[model samples]
Target: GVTTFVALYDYESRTETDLSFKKGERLQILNSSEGDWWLAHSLTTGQTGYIPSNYVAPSD
Candidate 1:
């Protein structure tokens, strides 16, 4: 499966969106648009958005 990550802090200042991701939370990778770019769905609110592929690393 693809990899993703939840925002530990309010990244709204960076993305300009209302987000509810918390620290230690896990986001599921739904798809990718460009190189190292991914669309992820928040496990908490079902809100999907784009995230930097460099922000998250392999769980294993």
Candidate 2:
């Protein structure tokens, strides 16, 4: 799953906005847009957006 940005990964310099799944959150691989990429919904206090398939990953 991909995320937009609630917080940004400084090393990546990119934001994880639409990543509803948190760090170490368990999720299932529904489907991928291309290869191992997935489109997911990210949430903040009051923000939402589309991230990249490469940004988010499964927890378990």
Candidate 3:
């Protein structure tokens, strides 16, 4: 399943299990079945990586 959402905070991957994004930026959710970690595609940076589920919210 996929969804569009807005990032609530800026994030830079500290390890291998994270994605980078800016606040209020749009991101396409790819996979979210891993509990706290979710796979997302960045529409802004054209990068795909894992992101924290709490870092984003449904876009308005």
Runs off by more than 4 Å, candidate 1: 1-10, 13-20, 32-34
lDDT of 1 by residue, 1-60 (tens): 665564544433157542445555567777553586566776666776666555554442
Q: How accurate is candidate 3 locally (lDDT)?
A: 0.81
Candidate 3: worst 10 consecutive residues by lDDT?
A: 29-38
Residue-level lDDT for 57 in candidate 2 = 46
Question: What residue pairs clash in candidate 3, if any at all?
Answer: none
Highest lDDT, which number?
3
lDDT of each: 0.57, 0.37, 0.81
Which model, 2 or 3, shows the larger TM-score? Answer: 3
TM-score to native of every candidate shown: 0.51, 0.28, 0.80
Q: Write the per-residue lDDT of candidate 2 for residues 1-60, one digit (tens) a residue.
A: 532322223112145533344443233333454564344443332223333444454432
Q: For model 3, state the Cα shift of residue 16 in Å.
A: 2.6
Candidate 2 stretches greater than 4 Å from native: 1-19, 33-51, 57-60
